[PDB]
Symmetry: D3
């Protein structure tokens, strides 16, 4: 059942069951982050280069190109076999891709999403995949930002919206605020 496979530059991981594709300029360290994510119990699908294909009108599947399966490159140290170092519960052949966390250089040209309200999207072979964009700032904990992006995406999809919750009690809060006397 083998359809077309385009190719994408990033890191595909599976965080709490969600396929999350990390993209970015180098000098951020997508893959250092990959590794820290596998220390924390998540699954590596592909490093650096990721095969994707369409499967439904609303579903993409990502995988590593067979040749690179299980392989991870640490600019510096060398190349490792993640399965050998971390075992089978650390790697997966594929996942659907629910979310792109695009890693962006913190320049104060333009701005970022401060409510979680934005709904940016990135088209991959017909499917618009939900995307988000976090500032990079040398020694942010990125693993954790990605972990939270993932958790918060599943929450919203399930009807727990934090953004909405806060728009909803903005007035009550302002009312309690001003009462600073």
């Amino acid at each position: 059942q083998l359809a077309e496979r385009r190719s994408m530059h990033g890191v595909l991981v599976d965080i709490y069951g969600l396929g999350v594709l990390i993209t970015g300029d180098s000098g951020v360290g997508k893959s250092e982050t990959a590794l820290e994510l596998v220390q924390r119990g998540h699954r590596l699908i592909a490093d650096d280069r990721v095969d994707v294909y369409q499967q439904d009108e609303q579903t993409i599947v990502g995988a590593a190109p067979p040749i690179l399966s299980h392989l991870l490159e640490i600019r510096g140290l060398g190349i490792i076999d993640v399965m050998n170092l971390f075992g089978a519960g650390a790697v997966r052949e594929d996942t659907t891709i629910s979310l792109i966390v695009h890693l962006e250089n913190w320049t104060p040209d333009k701005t970022f999403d401060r409510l979680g309200s934005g709904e940016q999207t990135q088209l991959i072979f017909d499917v618009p995949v939900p995307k988000i964009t976090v500032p990079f700032k040398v020694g942010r904990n990125l693993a954790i930002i990605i972990e939270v992006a993932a958790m918060n995406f599943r929450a919203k999809s399930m009807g727990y919206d934090a953004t909405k919750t806060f728009e909803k009690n903005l007035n009550h809060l302002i009312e309690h605020n001003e009462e600073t006397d």
Copy 2:
């Protein structure tokens, strides 16, 4: 496109596994053991299963009794609520059936889904068993197992000397 099975549907390391078979106050309590260890509950007690590919079952959460389990002594708990979003999931494909108290199959909608029957006795750390069941199924499908390791060993013994 619908159906219903008795069991627990967990996502262990990204792999969907269906635990069938009551007793030991198992299942519920075990679904729990699994969540505090970082895995995901899809559905306790009753699971709605349908069919994707010609070899893919998907299991889903009911839109009602959704991510709840019941523990005798404290009642009904809400997993999402107590554990947060990393503990609950909605979907997975079903890759392995782990049936409580060799290697087998069990078809549901003419999909021969891999199955394994664990001979159970009373003390048992079941969480770790299911965990290891899952890892090994993922290891097997990638070319690895005890018997290849054991032959590597026999070979090193016979020869390097």
Copy 3:
């Protein structure tokens, strides 16, 4: 009164982290919840005296256990991490003022305080955890500073 900064329960000890701008207090709090600790409140923490010795901090009746992460938006901690991650209140015991001995009166009460310089690629989560652990150690006997110094002092007194 009511105060700015992040209130966490780190291994049971209420610590007020009162760091600067940039270097996000909030990601720090996030990592602390991830590590098993509790958010009481981020910004606008409601503190109010109780004993001439002890000091409480609690969460506003509204929009408690919310947090803003740049890029991610508004996140709900109880939601994302479940119930072992939030707590309605705690007696504050130590304030960690991030940077980039000492004290701080709140309702006049003297509250112990510490300052970490922070530096290019420093994990605050861990330093803050350690400050808290060490506080409870100092507070229970066990000095380490004072012990090192005596052991050093007698080390110097030795010679031949």
Copy 4:
């Protein structure tokens, strides 16, 4: 300002008094909780007293401090084995949890006047009490914050029947 029997721990910040039979093995559950990030206050001999009309407090006796005995290993010093995250001098008790060898509506117990919510749990042979007690504690804080789950399931089941 009296004294009591049971294990006092701070589980994710909630003071929980563990009371239980003998063979249910309290101290060892104490130890498991310690290993999972929680604090021992006192194992047996907990010094409890009142604070306010509502609030009970439990503290470590000046001397047993963070010692406990494990059958076969003898006397172990919690702070010494696990370090400073594993012990605490005092906590408000919020919930008593009573383990049970015995096996056949909500509960309560009295300290210094105060009614103290009590939960009882049957130890079925081979169950994990660390996990159960953790969950009880988290669930007690969910309830206490408005999220019932029991009341919501019932209310959701109701409108379901009506949906005919």
Copy 5:
């Protein structure tokens, strides 16, 4: 280093750096316990059979018999390769053996060590190896008993001895209990 090798029936793990040899009977669950232990960050050296050898007069090294290297048997489902399931951080080719934790069926005929006073010992090639005997009671958490045994054993080695601390306050404490009227 090619010295004499005896064979012992048990489970050699490295807990927190210390080699511990777990002995006992069938039904105590030596190897399921092994597995929990490796879930928890420890390292398996040998399941079921352990090669031991003397190395100096206070030191014993244990290893897996090469043919059984990395292998572990779970009566539940067969035999697994622990390196493949758990990665390199989970296995180790050898360790010195500091401590024997012998698992005993709880039968009411023997009293058990209630202080950490006892200083039992088991001889292995002339080396008297320290040893502790814990009761098994199906459903108990052996993983943690063993971990605490390890930790307590290093604590005592280093001068922290909960038993002496207790003795030296036996009286202060007793004074304080009657001080409850």
Copy 6:
């Protein structure tokens, strides 16, 4: 006969690793990360070492300094006191040197034991705990016949030949 070296001696997954070459960062801060992640401290700052046989070096803790760390901001902390017995070790053979600098496969003699060494190109951002962890894990894997060049070869042959 004992010598003595500058660095941090840690036990990571049972492998003795010596981190040399203070990236101003604070190897003592990195030793810190490692103990909160489950590994063991033998000695910070200065480490006493000795030979044990050709091909084997041991690494021990001085009887004074002894499981202490200085963290700039809070001062001197006792690792055994704050973290407990699982966080510290009296000695350990040294199998690997990791040199933090602010193909390779290098060596470094200590008493005429060539001791495997690895240098890390370091820029500021680096999670170093994870790098050291990974180094440790990989040295072990390598010692056992696994590489990544072998993995890459396996993959190459799978792709060339279309399955197995």
